[PDB]
Amino acid sequence: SMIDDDGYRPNVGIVICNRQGQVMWARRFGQHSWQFPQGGINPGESAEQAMYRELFEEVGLSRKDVRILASTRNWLRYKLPKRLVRWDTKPVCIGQKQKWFLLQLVSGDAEINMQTSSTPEFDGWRWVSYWYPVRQVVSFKRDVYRRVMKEFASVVMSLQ
Amino acid sequence: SMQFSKMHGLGNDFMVVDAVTQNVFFSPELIRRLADRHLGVGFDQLLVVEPPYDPELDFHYRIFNADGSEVAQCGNGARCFARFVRLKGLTNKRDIRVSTANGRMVLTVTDDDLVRVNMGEPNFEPSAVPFRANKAEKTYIMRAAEQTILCGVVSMGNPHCVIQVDDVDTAAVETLGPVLESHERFPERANIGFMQVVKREHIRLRVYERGAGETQACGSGACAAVAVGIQQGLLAEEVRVELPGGRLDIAWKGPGHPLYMTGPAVHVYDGFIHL
Ligand SMILES: [Cl-]
Numbered sequence: 003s004m005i006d007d008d009g010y011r012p013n014v015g016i017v018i019c020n021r022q023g024q025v026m027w028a029r030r031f032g033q034h035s036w037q038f039p040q041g042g043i044n045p046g047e048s049a050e051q052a053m054y055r056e057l058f059e060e061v062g063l064s065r066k067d068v069r070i071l072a073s074t075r076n077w078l079r080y081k082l083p084k085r086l087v088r089w090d091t092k093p094v095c096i097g098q099k100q101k102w103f104l105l106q107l108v109s110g111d112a113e114i115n116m117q118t119s120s121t122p123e124f125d126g127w128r129w130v131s132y133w134y135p136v137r138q139v140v141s142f143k144r145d146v147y148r149r150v151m152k153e154f155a156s157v158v159m160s161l162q
Numbered sequence: 163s164m165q166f167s168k169m170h171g172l173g174n175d176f177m178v179v180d181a182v183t184q185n186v187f188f189s190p191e192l193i194r195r196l197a198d199r200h201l202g203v204g205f206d207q208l209l210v211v212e213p214p215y216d217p218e219l220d221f222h223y224r225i226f227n228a229d230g231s232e233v234a235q236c237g238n239g240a241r242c243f244a245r246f247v248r249l250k251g252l253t254n255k256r257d258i259r260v261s262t263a264n265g266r267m268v269l270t271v272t273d274d275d276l277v278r279v280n281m282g283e284p285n286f287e288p289s290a291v292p293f294r295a296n297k298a299e300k301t302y303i304m305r306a307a308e309q310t311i312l313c314g315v316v317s318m319g320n321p322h323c324v325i326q327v328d329d330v331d332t333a334a335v336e337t338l339g340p341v342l343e344s345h346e347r348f349p350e351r352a353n354i355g356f357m358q359v360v361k362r363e364h365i366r367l368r369v370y371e372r373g374a375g376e377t378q379a380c381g382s383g384a385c386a387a388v389a390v391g392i393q394q395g396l397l398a399e400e401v402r403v404e405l406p407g408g409r410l411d412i413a414w415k416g417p418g419h420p421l422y423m424t425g426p427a428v429h430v431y432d433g434f435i436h437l
């Protein structure tokens with residue numbers, strides 16, 4: 003019932019970068035599709051709150067493990083490919099509308115832990131070059147990823 | 163509107179496209195449409211910058227010709243690519259790691275905004291050229307019609323035979339070129355270089371390429387001329403090379419070390435085209 007009138011579920015996505023300009027790439031549990039962490043907004047939370055909660059529960063990072071460098075101005079939408087829509091579940095979710103955050107990891111790599119949850123959606127991670135996600139992400143997310151990585155590049159590039 | 167740039171490097175005209183932040187698919191039909199100077203943009207070659215395939219590389223790029231086929235010539239367009247990703251803010255690195263149809267390269271953008279390329283270590287073993295000779299000498303004699311000539315030969319990946327000339331304008335490129343290009347002692351032909359030594363760190367050069375003749379810029383020929391001039395004890399380890407197409411700077415500490423070629427890339431224009 004967070005689903006908008008259009009059928010878009012509000013979501014946050016997270017781009018975590020290190021000092022060298024790599025970004026964190028997470029493996030989805032029990033699969034080999036990779037992606038940036040993303041998660042639903044719950045009833046009553048802001049974007050930022052949902053982001054910090056997803057960040058801790060799926061990546062194991064606390065508010066002091068990172069700093070927010072940037073966030074997307076407006077929402078980015080993607081439609082799920084028609085075959086992926088659960089039509090029988092009312093109200094129907096036909097897509098996601100996302101606010102994206104760029105975070106810098108300010109503490110060491112050992113602070114990451116993808117098993118802080120016992121229902122973890124990600125079972126692995128690695129550092130990849132900044133643009134590698136735009137190619138490797140699943141096709142129906144690529145447009146959003148292109149726009150997000152475009153918006154964030156200046157901030158990340160201004161890390162000497 | 164698809165954004166693009168026009169750039170000039172190694173004496174060639176590139177249309178250069180950011181396909182990292184832009185969603186575009188370069189089918190051979192689109193490419194031929196773009197190559198058309200009245201319907202599209204017009205270019206010698208099309209350089210497309212793409213996200214990398216390998217998480218430890220920064221980019222991938224492809225080169226297409228006007229027929230819409232992908233070209234795989236080693237190091238082709240590397241200077242324009244490196245300057246381009248910097249100009250467009252796709253990266254801020256000075257050492258850019260990139261894959262191409264020919265493999266992986268590391269390109270360095272100098273503080274003068276030239277681009278330096280590792281070309282590998284030259285090879286003078288005649289089997290590797292391949293060259294008909296019993297052992298490697300710093301200089302070889304060859305008969306060429308009525309003439310006798312002295313030459314160095316080396317492999318930069320492809321074969322080269324380099325002659326010291328006293329002036330590249332008073333050099334019979336047009337007559338000696340073809341004769342040495344397909345001479346008996348080159349099983350796979352060879353690029354013939356004509357090298358006027360001005361100073362130990364400044365060469366003028368004209369190159370009669372393998373099966374192509376005179377081109378304004380053959381970077382591997384500049385690498386080759388400098389490599390033999392150094393092996394022969396004639397050149398400093400840092401040589402400016404003046405070709406019809408412009409200027410390259412070669413650097414090489416000699417055997418055991420790789421040879422570096424440095425060259426410019428000119429940003430000519432930006433442009434938009436609707437597809
Ligand atoms: Cl792509």
Ligand SMILES: [Cl-]
Binds near residue numbers: 170242427
């Ligand atoms: Cl170039």
